[PDB]
C-alpha cells in the first residue's frame, strides 16, 4: 500500500570531498606485479559530493539522474539505504527495476511497477522489521525476477557513530545492470572518512529497462512514517583514465586519476608513481 | 625496452579490421569477411 | 615449430542439445517495442533448429555466427517487423527498430530469423495493429524493452494526447498485402547473444605437453601445468606482463593453470665446408 510520511524534509546537503572512492575491479583478468592504464566509468578523485543527512523527518528520495551510471556510498548506522528504483519516468507508465534488500533476500524485478510517489521500506522502528515493500503494489509486463540467497540484516534505529560503510557502483550496458559492492568497517561522526576502498562485482542483471533516472529507496522508521540517521552520497561515474597499481596477489592497492591536475596527468604519461626531476612532454593542446 | 614494447603494443592495432586478433577474424567471422581483414592486419604488422 | 599433441576441452556440467520451441515453433509474435523475452540457458546449443523449421525463410545470422556460442544466456526474442525495418535489427545501427524498439548487444551476436507472413499477418488496408516506436525522449541501450502504453510528450513538456499538437509514439507499419516486400510483416526470432556453449565437450588435462585447448572463454595452443597464481573469486583468467593470457581457472575443476606457449626457435647449421667434409652439426 502506497502511503506517505507526516513530513518530508530536505537533507543538510553537507559538502564533502570523496578522495579515493569509486575504484573497482572492472574485468575478470588477474594481473600481478604490474601497472595497468585504462578507462571506464569511474568516480573521479576529489569529487565534490553532498551528504544526504536523512534524519527523523528528513527523507531524501526523489528522482535523481543516473544517465550512464552512478556512484553510491553510505556511512550507515540504522541501515537506511538498502534499495534503488531504476527507470525512466518513475510512474506506472514505463518499465522499471526495484532492487530491494528486504532484510532476508535481495529481491529484483523488472516490470511496469505501480510505483508509489514515496519509495520507502515500511519498517517498524523499535525492532527493525519490514511490514511491506511500500514501493510498489503490483506490476505488469515483466522481464525479470530474482531472489538471492537468504541472510539477516538488522535495520533498526541505531545510536552512536556510523559502524558500516558500503560502496556501490551501478551502470547500464547490454541490458546488464552491473552492480558492484565495496565494504569496510568504520567509526564515523560525520559525512564520510577518506581512504582507498575497492569494489568487486556482485550482480549481472539483464533487466532490460531504459535506465535514465534513479530513486534511492530509503528505510522508513516509525512505530505516518518517519526515518532515522544515515548519511549517504550521490556521485557520478565518468569515462576517465585511471592508472591501476597491482600487487603480488592482484589486489588494486592504489590508483591515479589522470585528469585531476597536471601532476597526475604526468604520472599517467610516465606510467609510474615516481617521477624524477625534470620536464616531460605531454599531450598537445 | 621501449623498442620492444613498441613492437609489442602494435600487435593490438586494429589497422582497419574489426579487431586486432587474427584468430577472431579467422574463427568468428565469415570466411569472405575473414580474408579481407587478414589482409589488413598482415600489411599493418609486417610493415610495423 | 613444436607440433602439438593433445586436446584439452574443459567445461562445467554438460547437458544435451535442448529442444528450442522458443526459437522456431512459435505461432504469433507481438510488436517490437514490447518484444516477448524467451531465453535459452544450460544447453549445448548449435541452433540448427533455426534452419530446420517449417515456419521461417531467411536463415541469416549477424552465417557462421550460428556457432558463436560459449557465453551467457541467449534470448530468443519474439516480434513482428516490416520489411523496411528488418534491416534495422542489428547491434547498434539505430534506425527506428534499434533506436527505440529493440537494440542488440555486440559482444557476441546470433541470428535474425524472419518469415514472409504476407498471407497471415497483413491485410489489404495495412495491419496497423502492429506498431513501432519512432519518437521517445531518450534512446534505448542494447537489450531493452519499452512497454509504455502511454501517450507521449514530444519534447518533454506536458503535451500528451488527447491534447492538440501532441504526438503518439507509435507509427503504423503499413502491413499492406497489395504492395511489395518492403511493406510486409516478418515474424522475427532474434537470438540475442548476451549459459550456453556450442563446442562444449569434456576431455582431460593433458598436462606438461604442447596441446590444443578450448576452455570456457579461452582457446589456443600451449603447455598446461598447475599454477600458484592467487585468483580472486571473481576472476576467470590471468594475463602476463604483456597482453597475452597466461593463466586460467579451470571451468570444470577450478584448478589454476599456467599456459606457457609451445616451444620454437631458429636453426643454425655448423659446417667446416664442402672442401673439408660433407657433414654438418645443427643448433
Ligand atoms: C599475498 O597473500 C599472501 C597470502 O598467501 C601473503 O602472504 C602472507 O603474508 C603474511 C604477512 O607478510 C605472512 O605472515 C608472516 O608470518 C611469519 C610467521 O608466522 C611472521 O614471522 C611474519 O611477521 C608475518 O606475519 C604469511 O606467512 C604469508 N603467507 C604466505 C602463504 O605467503 C602476502 O603477503 C600477500 N602479498 C602482499 C604483497 O601482501
Ligand atoms: C562543491 O559544491 C558546493 C556547492 O554545493 C560549493 O559550496 C559553495 O561554493 C561557493 C563557491 O564555490 C561558495 O561561495 C559557498 O560559500 C559554498 N557553500 C558551502 C555551503 O560550502 C563548494 O565550494 C564546492 N567545492 C569546491 C572545492 O569548490
Ligand atoms: C680445397 O682445400 C685444399 C687444401 O688442402 C686446397 O689446396 C684446394 O685448393 C681447395 N680447393 C679449391 C677448389 O680451391
Q: Is the dihedral of CA A161, A167, A172, A176 positive or negative?
A: negative
Quick check: is A167 in a domain?
yes
The set of cell numbers assigned to B48 is 610495423
- The residue among A100, A135, A139, A132 whose CA lies nearest residue A116 is A135
Local structure of C45: helix, strand or coil = coil
Instruction: Give, in degrees to the nearest 5, the angle at Cα A28 between A24 and A31.
Output: 85
C42 touches chain B (CB under 8 A): no
Task: Give the pairing type, strands C7-10 and C210-215.
Answer: parallel
Question: Could you tell me if C103 and C92 are in contact, meaning their C-beta atoms sit under 8 angstroms apart?
Answer: yes
Q: Alpha helix locations (H) across chain C?
A: 21-24, 83-86, 96-100
Check if the beta carbon of residue A225 is closer than 8 Å to that of residue A127. no
Chain C partners of B32 at a C-beta cutoff of 8 Å?
none
Q: Which three cell numbers stand for residue C233?
A: 573469486
Q: Which residues contact C143 (CB under 8 A, 6 or more apart)?
A: A174, A175, A176, A206, A208, C75, C103, C104, C105, C192, C194
| CA distances from residue C118 to A195, C29, C79, C211 in whole angstroms, order as listed | 64, 14, 15, 53
Q: Is A6 a member of any domain?
A: no
Q: Which residues surround ligand 1 with Cβ inside 6 Å? A: A 247-249
Q: Could you tell me the distance, in angstroms and rounded to a whole number, from the CA of residue A245 to the centre of ligand 1?
A: 20
Q: Phi and psi for A52 in degrees, rounded to 5?
A: -80, 85
How many C-alpha atoms does B9 have within 13 Å on its Cβ side? 7
Query: Nearest-CA neighbor of A135 among A182, A104, A169, A99?
Result: A99
Please give the backbone phi and psi of residue A274, each rounded to the nearest 5 degrees, phi first: -100, 125
Instruction: Say how far apart CA A110 and CA C139 lie, in whole Å.
Output: 18
The answer to the question of residue A9 being in a domain is no
Residue A141 lies in a domain: yes
Q: Which residue of chain A has the CA closest to C102?
A: A208
Ligand 2 in reach of A48 Cβ (< 6 A): yes
The domain spanning residue A203 has which CATH number? 2.60.120.960
Closest CA to B46 of B19, B6, B10: B10
**Exposure of A163 by Cβ count < 10 A (0-12 exposed, 13-18 middle, 19+ buried)?**
middle
Rounded-to-integer distance, Cα C131 and Cα C80, Å: 9
A214: cell is: 534513479
Mutate to test the interface with C, among A41, A93, A210 (most CBs of C within 10 A): A210
Give the range of the structural domain holding residue A111, as residue numbers without chain letter.
14-280
How far does chain B reach from its first CA to its final CA, in angstroms?
Answer: 17
Query: For residue A267, is it within any domain?
Result: yes
Ligand nearest to the CA of C274: 3
Residue C103 to residue C81: CA distance in whole angstroms = 13
Residue C23 CA to residue C66 CA, distance in Å, equals 13
Distances (CA, A) of C221 to A7, A281, C198: 67, 41, 19
| Cα–Cα distance for residue pair B14/B6, rounded to 1 Å | 15
* Number of domains observed in the structure of chain A: 1
- Domain contains A3: no
The Cα of A137 is separated from the nearest Cα of chain C by a number of Å equal to 18
CB C56 within 8 A of CB C19: no
The CA dihedral of C80, C85, C87, C91, to the nearest 10 degrees, is -70
Smallest CA-to-CA distance from A17 within A193, A158, A145, A183 is with A193
Residue A285 domain-assigned (yes or no): no
Q: What is the DSSP string of C116-145?
A: B-TTTS-BTT--TTSEEE---SSPPPSS--
* C63 vs B contacts (CB less than 8 Å): 30
Residues present in chain B in total: 48
In a domain, A1, yes or no: no
Amino acid at each position: 500500500r502506497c502511503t506517505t510520511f507526516d513530513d518530508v524534509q530536505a537533507p543538510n546537503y553537507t559538502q564533502h570531498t570523496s578522495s579515493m572512492r569509486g575504484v573497482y575491479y572492472p574485468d575478470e583478468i588477474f594481473r600481478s606485479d604490474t601497472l595497468y592504464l585504462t578507462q571506464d566509468l569511474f568516480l573521479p578523485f576529489y569529487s565534490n559530493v553532498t551528504g544526504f543527512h536523512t534524519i527523523n523527518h528528513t527523507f531524501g528520495n526523489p528522482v535523481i539522474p543516473f544517465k550512464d551510471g552512478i556512484y553510491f556510498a553510505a556511512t550507515e548506522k540504522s541501515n537506511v539505504v538498502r534499495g534503488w528504483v531504476f527507470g525512466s519516468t518513475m510512474n506506472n507508465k514505463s518499465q522499471s527495476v526495484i532492487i530491494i534488500n528486504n532484510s532476508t533476500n535481495v529481491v529484483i524485478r523488472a516490470c511496469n511497477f505501480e510505483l508509489c510517489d514515496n519509495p520507502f521500506f515500511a519498517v517498524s522502528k523499535p525492532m527493525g522489521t519490514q511490514t511491506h515493500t511500500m514501493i510498489f503494489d503490483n506490476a505488469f509486463n515483466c522481464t525479470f525476477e530474482y531472489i538471492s540467497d537468504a541472510f539477516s540484516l538488522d535495520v533498526s534505529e541505531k545510536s552512536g557513530n556510523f559502524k558500516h560503510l558500503r560502496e556501490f557502483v551501478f551502470k547500464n550496458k547490454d541490458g546488464f545492470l552491473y552492480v558492484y559492492k565495496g565494504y569496510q568497517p568504520i567509526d564515523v561522526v560525520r559525512d564520510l572518512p577518506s581512504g582507498f576502498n575497492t569494489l568487486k562485482p556482485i550482480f549481472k542483471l539483464p533487466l532490460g529497462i531504459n535506465i535514465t533516472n534513479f530513486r534511492a529507496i530509503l528505510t522508513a522508521f516509525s512505530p505516518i512514517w518517519g526515518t532515522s540517521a544515515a548519511a549517504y552520497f550521490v556521485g557520478y561515474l565518468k569515462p576517465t583514465t585511471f592508472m591501476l597499481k597491482y600487487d603480488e596477489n592482484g589486489t588494486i592497492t592504489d590508483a591515479v586519476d589522470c585528469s585531476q591536475n597536471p601532476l597526475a596527468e604526468l604520472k599517467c604519461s610516465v606510467k609510474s608513481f615516481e617521477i624524477d626531476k625534470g620536464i616531460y612532454q605531454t599531450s598537445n593542446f | 625496452a621501449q623498442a620492444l614494447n613498441t613492437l609489442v603494443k602494435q600487435l593490438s592495432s586494429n589497422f582497419g579490421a574489426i579487431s586486432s586478433v587474427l584468430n577472431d577474424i579467422l574463427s568468428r567471422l565469415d570466411p569472405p569477411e575473414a580474408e579481407v581483414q587478414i589482409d589488413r592486419l598482415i600489411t599493418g604488422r609486417l610493415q610495423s | 615449430r613444436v607440433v602439438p599433441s593433445g586436446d584439452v576441452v574443459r567445461f562445467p556440467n554438460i547437458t544435451n542439445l535442448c529442444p528450442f520451441g522458443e526459437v522456431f515453433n512459435a505461432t504469433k509474435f507481438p510488436s517490437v517495442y514490447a518484444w516477448e523475452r524467451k531465453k535459452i540457458s544450460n544447453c549445448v546449443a548449435d541452433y540448427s533448429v533455426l534452419y530446420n523449421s517449417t515456419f521461417f525463410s531467411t536463415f541469416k545470422c549477424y552465417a557462421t555466427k550460428l556457432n558463436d556460442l560459449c557465453f551467457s544466456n541467449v534470448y530468443a526474442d519474439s516480434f513482428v517487423v516490416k520489411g523496411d525495418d528488418v534491416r534495422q535489427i542489428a547491434p547498434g545501427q539505430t534506425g527506428v527498430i534499434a533506436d527505440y524498439n529493440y537494440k542488440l548487444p555486440d559482444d557476441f551476436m546470433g541470428c535474425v530469423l524472419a518469415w514472409n507472413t504476407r498471407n497471415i499477418d497483413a491485410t489489404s488496408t495495412g495491419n496497423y495493429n502492429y506498431k513501432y516506436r519512432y519518437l521517445r525522449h531518450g534512446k534505448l541501450r542494447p537489450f531493452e524493452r519499452d512497454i509504455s502504453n502511454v501517450p507521449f510528450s514530444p519534447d518533454g513538456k506536458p503535451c500528451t494526447p488527447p491534447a492538440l499538437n501532441c504526438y503518439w509514439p507509435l507509427n503504423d507499419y503499413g502491413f499492406y498485402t497489395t504492395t511489395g516486400i518492403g511493406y510486409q510483416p516478418y515474424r522475427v526470432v532474434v537470438l540475442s547473444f548476451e549459459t550456453v556453449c556450442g563446442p562444449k565437450l569434456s576431455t582431460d588435462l593433458i598436462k606438461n605437453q604442447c596441446v590444443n585447448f578450448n576452455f570456457n572463454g579461452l582457446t589456443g595452443t600451449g603447455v598446461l601445468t598447475p599454477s600458484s597464481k592467487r585468483f580472486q573469486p571473481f576472476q576467470q583468467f590471468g594475463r602476463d606482463v604483456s597482453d597475452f593470457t597466461d593463466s586460467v581457472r579451470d571451468p570444470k575443476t577450478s584448478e589454476i593453470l599456467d599456459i606457457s606457449p609451445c616451444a620454437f626457435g631458429g636453426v643454425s647449421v655448423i659446417t667446416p665446408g664442402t672442401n673439408a667434409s660433407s657433414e654438418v652439426a645443427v643448433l
